[PDB]
Amino acid sequence: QQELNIRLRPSTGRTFYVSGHQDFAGALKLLHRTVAANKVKKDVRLQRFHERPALKRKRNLRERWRARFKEGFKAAVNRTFELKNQGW
Amino acid sequence: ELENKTYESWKKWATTEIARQESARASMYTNVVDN
Amino acid sequence: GVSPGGALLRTSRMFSLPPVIPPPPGNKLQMISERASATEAYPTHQVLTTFESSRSRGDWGLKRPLPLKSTTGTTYPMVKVKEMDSLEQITDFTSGTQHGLTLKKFQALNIPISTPSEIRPVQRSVFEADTDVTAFSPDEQIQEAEKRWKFSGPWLAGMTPGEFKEYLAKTVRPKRAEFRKFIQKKIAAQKTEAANRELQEKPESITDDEVTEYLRRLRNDNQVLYDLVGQFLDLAPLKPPSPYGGRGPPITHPSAGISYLRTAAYLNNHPIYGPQKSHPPVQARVLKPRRGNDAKIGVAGFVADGPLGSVMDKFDPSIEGGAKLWVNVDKATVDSTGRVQLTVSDAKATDVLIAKELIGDAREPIFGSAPK
Amino acid sequence: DEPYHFHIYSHKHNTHITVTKPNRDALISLSCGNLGFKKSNRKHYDSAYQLGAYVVDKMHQMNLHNKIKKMEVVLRGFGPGREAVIKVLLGNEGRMLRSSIVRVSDATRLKFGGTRSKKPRRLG
Amino acid sequence: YLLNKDEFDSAIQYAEHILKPIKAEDRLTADPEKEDEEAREHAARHAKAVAALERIAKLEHGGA
Amino acid sequence: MLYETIGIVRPGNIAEVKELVLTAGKLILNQGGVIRDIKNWGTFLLPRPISTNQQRHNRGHYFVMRYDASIATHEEVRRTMKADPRVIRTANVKLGDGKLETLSRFGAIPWRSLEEA
Amino acid sequence: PNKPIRLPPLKQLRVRQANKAEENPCIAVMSSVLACWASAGYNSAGCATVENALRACMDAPKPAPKPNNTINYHLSRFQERLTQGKSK
Amino acid sequence: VQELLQSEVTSNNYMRMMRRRWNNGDVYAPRDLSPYEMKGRNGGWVEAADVVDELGFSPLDNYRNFSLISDYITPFGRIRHSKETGLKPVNQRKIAKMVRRAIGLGIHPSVHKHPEILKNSNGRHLLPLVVPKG
Amino acid sequence: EKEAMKSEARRDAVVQLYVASKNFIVDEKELEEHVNKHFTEKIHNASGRSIWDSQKNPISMRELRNEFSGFNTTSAAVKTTVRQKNVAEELTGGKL
RNA sequence: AUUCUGUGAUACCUAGGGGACGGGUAAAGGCGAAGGCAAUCUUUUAUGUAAAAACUGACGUCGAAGGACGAAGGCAAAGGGAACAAAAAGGAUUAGAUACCCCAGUAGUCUUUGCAGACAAUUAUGAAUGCCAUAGGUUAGAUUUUUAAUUUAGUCUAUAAA
Ligand SMILES: [K+]
Ligand SMILES: [K+]
Ligand SMILES: [K+]
Ligand SMILES: [K+]
Ligand SMILES: [K+]
Ligand SMILES: [Mg+2]
Ligand SMILES: [Mg+2]
Ligand SMILES: [Mg+2]
Ligand SMILES: [Mg+2]
Ligand SMILES: [Mg+2]
Ligand SMILES: [Mg+2]
Ligand SMILES: [Mg+2]
Ligand SMILES: [Mg+2]
Ligand SMILES: [Mg+2]
Ligand SMILES: [Mg+2]
Ligand SMILES: [Mg+2]
Ligand SMILES: [Mg+2]
Ligand SMILES: [Mg+2]
Ligand SMILES: [Mg+2]
Ligand SMILES: [Mg+2]
Ligand SMILES: [Mg+2]
């Protein structure tokens, strides 16, 4: 501000304020969803030890396929009920 | 008439679904001490 | 030229199915939901029907017979086919009653579709021979270009900044040579109008440098040039310097093929009460009450704004089947986005009683037990 | 005017709670070992809960539930104390302080690249 | 930019022509002090364009 | 080529920011360049407090300058700016795809609109 | 964003747990009782109500299980038609 | 009169369950009022098309726009995945490189949104301040 | 003819760069006159000392989408004329 | 446990200095002869891909040798030194423990200039040419009634003939 300056630090972005329609218990839930969507906990676990480039590339390939397989599996499960509903 | 019969089904769902949020919302706080 | 087998398939019924038309256009930059989808503004697939003796067998003229559980039992046999045979070796179909019965419920209102008006209410049919025309001659001037409804060029105000650049690069840029010829044909009319007006007291029509100068003269008056450019690219009028150039021309026929009546100027002759003052009322359902401060009502399956005037102000869970209101459909029109918009108005009191009397819902019948 | 701060640093083996002034000067800097918890008893969820209740109690003695009108809760780390101490402030102990909370921040430290970490352990 | 002195000069002469202020369509009400000034504003505005464009199209200001 | 330099100078003295714009401007014109636009953004917050020349700055006086110049001229603007102790930070960029059609649509520096491309 | 992949040929297309294995509805009540003892004490009076709720758990009968979900039967019908095949 | 206030609470409660915005011209059937349709099974507010093509702008040429950078980063300063932006791989790379340029040049923060954008967003008087401490 | 089209396209780019040359600065005289006008202490409605004050924010995505989703209502008029002119210039070849 | 801390640590801050590293984006994605290549600005460099025309007119493929390039570790010299870490050493565990684990820690990793030439340097598959039926994805374009199809060059999945 004109008198006091804003504290611009990584925590400034991870801040959630209490207002009329949002109480302390409500700001905690919003803080947990954003901290989860941004995968802050996963980074703390991956930055604890060093993973050389080859191991990181191969770990991503295993996790990226399980994500496609799981996403393609949910589409087949729900496509099965679209056909069952039609009576096939 | 078909809309009436279908609107009622929604009313029952909304009435039964809103009770879930208000109950789970009020119970969010750990006020079980009953001070 | 074609084998007898190919000649039969051409005139076949399954070959006459219309292609799937694009869905009703929506906000291009706005977000939507891709998993779930509700009823569309207007239908995109053809609704199919069978004989009652064939429906019991599941035969719908398709590749395979349809399941009986999801196609039998109802009153109106209607089906929409998305793929006659999908990668699952099944006919991806769905019920077609959401639009098949919305058409019958709308036509039950017995109201035409009028041209959009501006705000002296003058409801003019959209099937008039002077306005409803699509074939035009190259001699077609500008004053009569406002009556049309089907233009070849796009509406510049409706395009996005991206679609407009693609248009300037692939449609108007390679038409410069053709436009210069279009001017020469005008010069043929400019040199003959002054050269043949005194004979009752054609020109070469091929020039190269004269055209370059004539265009410069028009730089002082930009309006006369836009009318000349739009007439060539067949652009829909934009501003008055008239045919509702606010939201743009309609992407379909002004009627959209939902109603073909040309006027509502008629009286309903009641069996006992003689002619009526207004058309019979229609009961509507209240959706999204004011408490956006605007209300929405469902009339014959279409959503419209509530009458300009409670039940439409605050939600009431005590009312069974939701809040309902008797109204009268004054005007119906088709906007530029293909939607059907109704200008509903509140219904009178005596009329709702007359309508309820026939169906047996009036409490105090106006006949017999009405001393005053 | 900046509020007070209720930093809650928690990791796998211990939890630190710091209550600072608006200028970020520590008033109550305690840990699980201040309550007598020895080498390994500091990582327990229960020990982190008692530390939170102890700090809240020590604040009342100092008359901070009346002096503090605006307070911020800063979370650092994802240890057991991250949830334990929150249930103290959100429970019956933080009844007086729960009304003066205006912000909820997360100050977990991450590195965009940074120095190399330890080599992976082979436990088996 | 794949230009040459010929194409460049032809474009300058073309831009000056289409942008040349057209005088009054007649001589009856032609306002002299308003036309002669537009000729100088166009001439001055033209000289500024030739100078700026000669510097942008200069091949010495290009890269590899 | 078409370049664009964003300069962030120390706030407080308007004479300083005017001397840098004129110095970097006269350098572009004398070398044979063309300045397309110079916008004067005022003094607002920096991305974060940064220390330069033994001073802790929280704000800075921004200004954008778009010019057509040669590589040697562009490298001298960056060198002179960086060497000046009154600039907190400078950002330079080569606009466009290097083609004539895209380069002809760069006029005034936008704030309430985008660069058409 | 891409669309869900077409699953490769699998030995069998099925979900591991067809019916949601819901949790004992009282393990949550006990946590509340254990929460009061940590804040209000053991022999206190505030926790006298939660204890009654906990005693009410075990005195009530256990809800009967739901009928099995037939999802796996329908997944096995549309496997070859929904995926690239079936492994032998 | 307090009995009238609780009615407003019950009313707005149901209004929240009607997860649909009715518009003029929208056709609806008796099925469009049932729970299965109001539930809104779609758990994603997907974007219609690639806005970079619809708006027709070059990201790299608009790196100096602080609002555009903050729109394609999370509150933590992390570039948004193509799932959220709904862009093609080519346009995703141009907007990702546009964010990295602005942050790399040092004109936009990297762990939150621009300070001048935080001054306007909700929580203005509550922004973290820096006490001089001396 | 194919090389003429490439030459005509290369010409229109110079005509557009010719029109835009009105606001360029080519001499020190225009530079000084430009700086002394825009670089003053009370240019941003001084109160305000930054472009964020006079002009609220740089146009965002929400502001770019509302221009084509929310409104569609009169701003389309000024937008319809600039587009109606671009079609004439690029079709006529001039700079109407 | 060795170890750090009353010479005030951990925790919470303010103000300066230093070295490397590269979060999200990110994908079955891309680039190069391979090795390999992921923050950012400017400068600089050879191929490759699409569509149309124009141009040269067999100017092509492979290629012993020579020469060039070639991961990590390593040698030599001069810098750098935060972090990590062979060696050396200490504390534990164990029947014993060089070890796996832990407190610390030097070469080395990084910079510049040379040497060196060995790799699961892998697709366990040399390079290139002609040719053989489909399907579902995906990458960069092109065409179109740009919805979606058609098509060129890549890449992957599952099959037919074989
Ligand atoms: K301590
Ligand atoms: K490799
Ligand atoms: K170490
Ligand atoms: K040892
Ligand atoms: K392919
Ligand atoms: Mg170690
Ligand atoms: Mg072991
Ligand atoms: Mg000290
Ligand atoms: Mg450094
Ligand atoms: Mg990365
Ligand atoms: Mg390649
Ligand atoms: Mg060769
Ligand atoms: Mg050899
Ligand atoms: Mg080496
Ligand atoms: Mg070395
Ligand atoms: Mg050495
Ligand atoms: Mg190296
Ligand atoms: Mg060598
Ligand atoms: Mg290797
Ligand atoms: Mg070989
Ligand atoms: Mg690849």
XYZ file of N, CA and C in Angstrom, chain B residues 6-28:
69
model
N -43.263 -35.369 -12.491
C -41.805 -35.353 -12.476
C -41.259 -34.255 -11.574
N -41.945 -33.114 -11.501
C -41.511 -32.049 -10.604
C -41.525 -32.516 -9.154
N -42.547 -33.283 -8.769
C -42.616 -33.792 -7.404
C -41.396 -34.644 -7.075
N -41.014 -35.538 -7.989
C -39.843 -36.376 -7.753
C -38.608 -35.527 -7.484
N -38.483 -34.392 -8.173
C -37.362 -33.496 -7.913
C -37.490 -32.840 -6.545
N -38.703 -32.430 -6.173
C -38.902 -31.799 -4.873
C -38.475 -32.733 -3.747
N -38.880 -34.002 -3.825
C -38.470 -34.968 -2.812
C -36.956 -35.123 -2.784
N -36.323 -35.156 -3.957
C -34.871 -35.283 -4.008
C -34.194 -34.054 -3.415
N -34.640 -32.861 -3.812
C -34.058 -31.636 -3.272
C -34.267 -31.551 -1.765
N -35.483 -31.849 -1.303
C -35.765 -31.792 0.128
C -34.913 -32.794 0.896
N -34.681 -33.972 0.317
C -33.849 -34.977 0.964
C -32.363 -34.717 0.763
N -31.989 -34.002 -0.297
C -30.588 -33.700 -0.557
C -30.112 -32.462 0.187
N -31.006 -31.510 0.457
C -30.611 -30.317 1.199
C -30.377 -30.660 2.664
N -31.178 -31.576 3.213
C -30.968 -32.006 4.590
C -29.578 -32.597 4.780
N -29.011 -33.187 3.727
C -27.671 -33.755 3.824
C -26.628 -32.662 4.027
N -26.722 -31.577 3.257
C -25.728 -30.513 3.356
C -25.842 -29.775 4.684
N -27.056 -29.353 5.047
C -27.231 -28.602 6.286
C -26.805 -29.429 7.492
N -27.074 -30.736 7.465
C -26.659 -31.598 8.567
C -25.148 -31.791 8.565
N -24.581 -32.147 7.410
C -23.135 -32.314 7.321
C -22.405 -30.994 7.534
N -23.019 -29.876 7.143
C -22.385 -28.576 7.334
C -22.325 -28.208 8.812
N -23.462 -28.287 9.507
C -23.481 -27.957 10.928
C -22.567 -28.881 11.720
N -22.512 -30.156 11.343
C -21.652 -31.121 12.015
C -20.189 -30.993 11.613
N -19.860 -30.099 10.678
C -18.463 -29.912 10.297
C -17.627 -29.498 11.500
